[PDB]
Subunit: 160 residues, 3 copies
């Protein structure tokens, strides 16, 4: 019960499905807590599903919850998340749902209730105030090394 | 006009396409502002497109802009973003472009100019200074619970 | 050698493959350092591979490493990362591996050893303490504008 971690943050969670464990970090230091599937789902190759996790959270104002795929499933069976990283807003009070998708070309993926199918990170976010300018120069911003370079401008692959 | 939010950050934006609304948060607290498509795009199943948003921003030095898919489109029509999360560097002064892709196997996705097709988050990032070491032990780092465990090492699915 | 950047963070790195350059930022201010492939890989359409980068890092406790696709490859050849954003935990001391996938329907992607195939960001993360509540109301949280709205509730596309 002693906070060693004084400024570590408290995430209210409702287990909409009390049958599932509370999400937890696999190892100390891990960035996310793993989310369970509340249901059994089979995804044929290329199919997607919106899977309930059985939890609702209250991400603090000034923060964001981020739903990330797990790496093992991604490589072993081609499981991904369509909208990755899923963006859980501070005001959301609904059930977190995971948009799983099977990116394997031939093997279906079976998800069982109680499987760990994603991980939830919480991070700060900047709640930005847009300042519309006619040009960056007019806003007095110094030019930058990057400039308008994008889309592979730095090279690093034959196709770029 | 009164800043209630004293340390909230200001994002210079140029509407390269003045016909589109400024990106905005759907709800108070939302992590991102939605980006519009400046153009009409149809994506057949499996096709991708680099779609202009009509905006350029100046992400502050020490921050990153992150282009995330919207969840509704992801589930309803299989819209995703190839390079999600798109990484907008602080020095970039070009147009934000969104690499949309249709991950549905059969139904095309029609995007109209003025549709909200992604969301932009701004977060701090650590501008890391690499310190090359011959080993972590030699750097005097304590071993960790995780160690070299990865790629599903904690289990949580039959395939792992 | 003078720190202009006083509070900028130090990332221990082991070049497991000393033949590859240390990851670097393409431009000042860039959010990530580019990761190299340590190996030659060809991905037929729809195939994925777990590619070694030749590096191990020690992400600081209270932080996360994030493996993001590069935008140029994503658009030019449909390269993506299955588990994007890859989540490198602070305790991980193994090799960073990148789950590349070819989302192009017809053209294979050839990766050569020494190509820059992803970028690594480091960010703070909140190591959340879950507080289970029976309801948010019972936790005394004010209702929110968003409520349980999700999954396209704000509209912005014909399909929503
Ligand atoms: O979704 C995105 C991602 C990047 N961008 C722009 C801004 C970013 O600063 C720039 C480079 O992004 P990446 O580093 O992710 N791509 P890549 O490494 O291919 O390009 P470069 O070689 O220019 O760094 O491309 C977009 O417009 N949309
Ligand atoms: O892109 C990635 C993602 C993860 N990793 C390594 C470092 C990370 O700490 C570790 C576990 O990542 P995930 O938690 O995302 N995967 P999973 O939950 O399957 O593995 P584990 O059960 O070990 O947590 O795998 C990579 O090398 N590359
Ligand atoms: O992976 C996700 C992403 C979002 N969500 C919920 C919480 C988030 O606050 C809400 C809206 O997320 P998006 O803004 O990414 N989606 P979209 O813009 O389609 O919905 P809305 O129009 O409600 O903002 O949907 C999930 O349950 N899982
Ligand atoms: Mg894990
Ligand atoms: Mg939204
Ligand atoms: Mg780059």
């Amino acid at each position: 019960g002693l906070v060693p971690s004084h400024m570590s943050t408290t995430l209210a969670i409702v287990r909409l499905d009390p049958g599932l464990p509370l999400p937890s970090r696999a190892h100390d230091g891990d960035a996310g807590v793993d989310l369970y599937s509340a249901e059994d789902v089979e995804l044929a190759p290329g199919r997607r599903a919106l899977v309930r996790t059985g939890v609702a959270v209250a991400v603090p104002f000034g923060m964001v919850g981020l739903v990330h795929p797990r790496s093992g499933l991604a490589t072993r069976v081609g499981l991904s998340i369509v909208n990755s990283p899923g963006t859980i807003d501070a005001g959301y009070r609904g059930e977190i749902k995971v948009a799983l998708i099977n990116l394997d070309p031939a093997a279906p993926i079976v998800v069982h209730r109680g499987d760990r199918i994603a991980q939830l990170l919480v991070q700060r976010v900047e709640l930005v105030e847009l300042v519309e300018v006619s040009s960056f120069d007019e806003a007095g911003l110094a030019s930058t090394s990057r400039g308008d370079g994008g889309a592979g401008s730095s090279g690093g692959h034959a196709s770029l």
